[PDB]
Design a protein around this ligand. Structure first.
Ligand code: HEM
Ligand SMILES: *[C@@H]1O[C@H](CO)[C@@H](O[C@@H]2O[C@H](CO)[C@@H](O[C@H]3O[C@H](CO)[C@@H](O)[C@H](O)[C@@H]3O)[C@H](O)[C@H]2NC(C)=O)[C@H](O)[C@H]1NC(C)=O
Ligand SMILES: *[C@@H]1O[C@H](CO)[C@@H](O[C@@H]2O[C@H](CO)[C@@H](O[C@H]3O[C@H](CO)[C@@H](O)[C@H](O)[C@@H]3O)[C@H](O)[C@H]2NC(C)=O)[C@H](O)[C@H]1NC(C)=O
Ligand SMILES: *[C@@H]1O[C@H](CO)[C@@H](O[C@@H]2O[C@H](CO)[C@@H](O)[C@H](O)[C@H]2NC(C)=O)[C@H](O)[C@H]1NC(C)=O
Ligand SMILES: *[C@@H]1O[C@H](CO)[C@@H](O[C@@H]2O[C@H](CO)[C@@H](O)[C@H](O)[C@H]2NC(C)=O)[C@H](O)[C@H]1NC(C)=O
Ligand SMILES: O=C(NO)c1ccccc1O
Ligand SMILES: [Ca+2]
Length: 595
């Protein structure tokens, strides 16, 4: 009896073993072990958790306790001394479009979500944490350094609440603390449809037999849909501009409105589901609502899987791609498809790819208006700019014509995210995503940098000179040493991202290994992987591999000129072709004949 028992945050259902459709919760994917990969279960552990008291307290909680003999540096100090920079000039990725960054966030949200602990609204807890900066229970504050300008301007700390854990929610005492993944581990478009039956149903248009998703009724985009507004007040979206009073959107995932470009991608996907569903109603007039919904949903999930694995991963892993993700051999029921705890930190390499501004372009791809280029921080939880400032068409063009930020050892995360992050729960544009990531690593009980190097079969630097050789950077390796005093204590998020990029990729050795294993596993352990014989017919497969993000844009926006390879850097007008030159998805293979 391994630690086999606990199972509390989870459901009630039966499995229909011959259903051709995925469940909403992920349950029933694996036949021998039904709960594998399902939502609201613990993140898998590739290595034992490392807590200060061996079970739940994070390192840095008890100032008198050390980690391998040394105090762990304050998250915000590492942020200031290492992660920050002032000059945005020369920081853009010359061969990756803004879409490269945006797709990563989409894939990250489809796979993992560890929500913070709630326990109390009409509670002085939210007060005692933000107002007095008192560590205790789920309040684990990010204290400011001496000499930090936020001390003079914001307070003594940044509130931070520990992530939820399986089993309960109130105090737990025996086995080690395991964080929750609130979404399904399979790449299945759960960010569009939801991971709970509760929300999946609410997102659907059930008053009509067409299998469509509910759309906004207050607002339209030149005859195209917007996601419906969300029903919870107070909403962070109307707070950022109490005059416009425009709420956040309602999507399969709760993070949809964190930033305008993410909300934009969610809208494109919502539209494709409806486009697909009314297009299927046309070929199969007899199919009912449920059939239309499931069938369009199945297609959309295949689309996300194809673009991710054919177009996105090859340019993230580069030459390491083949090393971790060999060609598909078919479904393997012995593979654990669960997303690991460390993956949720390794996938955060994307934060260093976010630029400081977002632009809106007009039909010739020229600046759209007088204030076309805006600072990223004014777009956090901003939905009013979409509904009241031109729709998504100007934003989508920016995604195609602008570049991502390139990871740079001297310029890691932009100040828009490092000093001005807005949290849905608080009211200042003054948080630090980098310090939060570091703090969260400790909160999740992550092993140090060298434990992961070993796990991936990579050398493990013990000295400064050793760290210089791995990082190939003398001064970085030595800021790192002055703060951490041993490479063993380096938090994985900063350690992984500090490594030089592999050839043709955008991450280093350690990250390539961690990312590559995870993706190989969610592909091989998915009974509904699009290439698995029997999921789709041979003819449906020939049709599916013609999808492209470019075509998705053409069919769901009023944009008529798009690049052929949307993820690489493309210059207008030279790299842009006419939408009619672009491959469509041929849905005829989905036509049925029941007589
Ligand atoms: C403007 C762009 C982005 C913003 C503003 C943003 C913001 C955030 C915030 C606030 C968190 C919660 C952190 C915590 O409490 O621990 C988070 C988590 C995360 N982000 Fe980002 N993010 C952005 C882009 C990206 C991109 C491009 C990727 C990948 C390519 C990515 C991957 C992740 C992952 C994996 C998590 C942890 C998710 C979980 O499992 O709970 N993010 N982000
Ligand atoms: C900017 O990035 C581009 C995409 O990453 C890159 O083009 C890619 O170059 C690789 C070189 O390995 C080629 O990869 C493809 O090679 C053949 C196609 O001829 C296929 O059999 C392989 O499976 C593989 O997909 C491609 O030619 C191309 N990749 C794609 C997806 O189009 C550019 O070279 C980069 N531009 C600059 C200036 O560096
Ligand atoms: C909060 O949202 C407000 C409304 O969405 C926004 O004000 C709006 O934006 C500007 C005001 O600065 C005006 O837009 C422009 O409209 C035409 C372009 O078609 C121009 O010819 C006008 O001169 C004008 O500049 C809108 O009139 C204005 N709308 C309202 C109702 O005031 C605020 O700027 C937002 N406030 C913040 C702090 O973000
Ligand atoms: C659910 O679907 C119905 C029908 O497709 C939507 O209503 C139609 O679409 C628009 C807006 O209402 C108009 O063309 C007609 O008024 C409707 N036609 C029919 C035949 O009803 C409705 O908007 C959808 N509801 C939600 C919440 O998305
Ligand atoms: C299905 O996946 C399993 C688990 O990943 C694979 O297991 C391999 O088999 C060896 C022994 O034969 C195990 O020690 C390892 O777990 C795996 N090999 C290596 C090199 O790590 C298994 O090979 C897969 N089965 C099929 C039929 O492909
Ligand atoms: O944008 C986010 N993640 O990419 C995000 C936003 C708010 C809360 C948690 C999150 O992970
Ligand atoms: Ca999923």
């Amino acid at each position: 009896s391994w630690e086999v028992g606990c199972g509390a945050p989870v459901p009630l259902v039966k499995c229909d073993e011959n259903s051709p459709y995925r469940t909403i919760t992920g349950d029933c994917n694996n036949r021998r072990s039904p709960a594998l990969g399902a939502a609201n279960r613990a993140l898998a552990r590739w290595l034992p958790a490392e807590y200060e008291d061996g079970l739940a307290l994070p390192f840095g909680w008890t100032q008198r306790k050390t980690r391998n003999g040394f105090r762990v540096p304050l998250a915000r100090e590492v942020s200031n001394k290492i992660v920050g920079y002032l000059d945005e000039e020369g920081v853009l990725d010359q061969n990756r479009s803004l879409l490269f960054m945006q797709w990563g966030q989409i894939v990250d949200h489809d796979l993992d979500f560890a929500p913070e602990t709630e326990l109390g609204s009409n509670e002085h807890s939210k007060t005692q944490c933000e107002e007095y900066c008192i560590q205790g229970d789920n309040c684990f504050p990010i204290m400011f350094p001496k000499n930090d300008p936020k001390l003079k301007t914001q307070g003594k700390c940044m509130p931070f609440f520990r992530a939820g854990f399986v089993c309960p929610t109130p105090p737990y005492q025996s086995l080690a603390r395991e964080q929750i993944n609130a979404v399904t581990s399979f790449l299945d478009a759960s960010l569009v449809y939801g991971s709970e039956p509760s929300l999946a149903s609410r997102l659907r248009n059930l008053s009509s037999p067409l299998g469509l998703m509910a759309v906004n009724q207050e607002a339209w985009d030149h005859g195209l849909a917007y996601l419906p507004f969300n029903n919870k007040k107070p909403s962070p979206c109307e707070f950022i501009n109490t005059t416009a009073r425009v709420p956040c959107f309602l999507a399969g995932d709760f993070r949809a409105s964190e930033q305008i470009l993410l909300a934009t991608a969610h809208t494109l996907l919502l539209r494709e589901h409806n486009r697909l569903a009314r297009e299927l109603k046309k070929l199969n007039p007899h199919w009912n609502g449920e059939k239309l919904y499931q069938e369009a949903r199945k297609i959309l999930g295949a689309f996300i899987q194809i673009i991710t694995f054919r177009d996105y991963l090859p340019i993230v892993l580069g030459s390491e791609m083949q090393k971790w993700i060999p060609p598909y051999q078919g479904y393997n029921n012995s593979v654990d498809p669960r997303i690991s705890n460390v993956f949720t930190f390794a996938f955060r390499f994307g934060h260093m790819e976010v630029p400081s501004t977002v632009s809106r372009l007009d039909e010739n791809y020229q600046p759209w208006g007088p204030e076309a280029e805006l600072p990223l921080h004014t777009l956090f939880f901003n939905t009013w700019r979409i509904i009241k400032d031109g729709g998504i068409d100007p934003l989508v063009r920016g995604l195609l014509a602008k570049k991502s930020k390139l990871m740079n050892q001297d310029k890691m995360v932009t100040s828009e995210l490092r000093n001005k992050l807005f949290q849905p729960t608080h009211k200042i544009h003054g948080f630090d995503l980098a310090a939060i990531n570091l703090q969260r690593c400790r909160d999740h009980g992550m092993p140090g940098y060298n434990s992961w190097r070993g796990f991936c079969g990579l050398s493990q630097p013990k000295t400064l000179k050793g760290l210089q050789t791995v990082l190939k950077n003398k001064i970085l390796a030595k800021k790192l040493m002055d703060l951490y005093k041993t490479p063993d204590n380096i938090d994985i998020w900063i350690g992984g991202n500090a490594e030089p990029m592999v050839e043709r990729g955008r991450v280093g050795p350690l990250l390539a290994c961690l990312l590559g294993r995870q993706f190989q596993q969610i592909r091989d352990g998915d009974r509904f992987w699009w290439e698995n014989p029997g999921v789709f017919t041979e003819k449906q497969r020939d049709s599916l591999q013609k999808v492209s993000f470019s075509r998705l844009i053409c069919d769901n926006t009023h944009i008529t000129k798009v690049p052929l390879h949307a993820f690489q850097a493309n210059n207008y007008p030279h790299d842009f072709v006419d939408c009619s030159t672009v491959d469509k998805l041929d849905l005829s293979p989905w036509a049925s004949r029941e007589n």
